[PDB]
Assembly symmetry: C4
Homo-oligomer: 78 residues x 4
């Protein structure tokens, strides 16, 4: 397997990456955590970024997540 | 394995994602389904979007699919 | 596993996709084959496209391939 | 498995690709090595490139790496 998804880069340089530890990480370009988002399963899918900055990623809990840029859930799709 | 491919984002913000349930999903940015497209196998490949909006994704049924933005098959390649 | 890599789209709309059948495929947007390129192993890696149109993809024969837009080998890196 | 991640392309055409041999490779468009970066595990994740050229990739040593364009470590995140 792979511990990390491929990263995605936001407008301000934020680095978003999924982990098989079940979290989506948002990392500042300075290497400090901005936030992390808890899903119910491994995040192998590489995040995509919408035109408005929404971060989308699938989880092995079977949901497609839409996360606001501040780390709060926008919605999940099953 | 992974339940989801990595998502792709269309011009209008539509989120396209493959599933190992054999479907390609097109999701409105509001979290409601736009359409889903039935293939014959797991869609692990992450979709790509052409300049005219066509959505391309491979399936483990061994076909490369070209899907119109309205969810109708354009062609499949083997 | 997955039969297909994720596709990449060229300037003219050409769709490039790797297969576990060991080939990199270049498909016209009309669904007809432009060319295919034979490697020595499964092409699980998703191709990337350079600014000059070169197509790059890794193969499980352990080479990173650079392919010209006309399907001829440019170089391979090990 | 897959020996290579999907490649990423830098501003000057440099091709960045991870290997399950634990290294991230930066290859000149002419096919000669620019540098390689040693991690502690397979680099299955496909690199992403920041707006300032930083290369980000995850490794199965459980770190997300930020690498400067000259191949020197910028930081690693766990």
């Amino acid at each position: 397997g792979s511990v990390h998804s491929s990263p995605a880069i936001g407008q301000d340089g934020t680095i978003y990456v999924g982990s098989n530890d079940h979290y989506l990480y948002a990392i500042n370009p300075n290497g400090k955590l901005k936030w992390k988002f808890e899903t119910g399963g491994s995040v192998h899918s590489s995040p995509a970024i919408g035109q408005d900055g929404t971060i989308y990623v699938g989880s092995n809990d079977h949901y497609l997540y839409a996360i606001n840029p501040n780390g709060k859930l926008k919605w999940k799709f099953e």
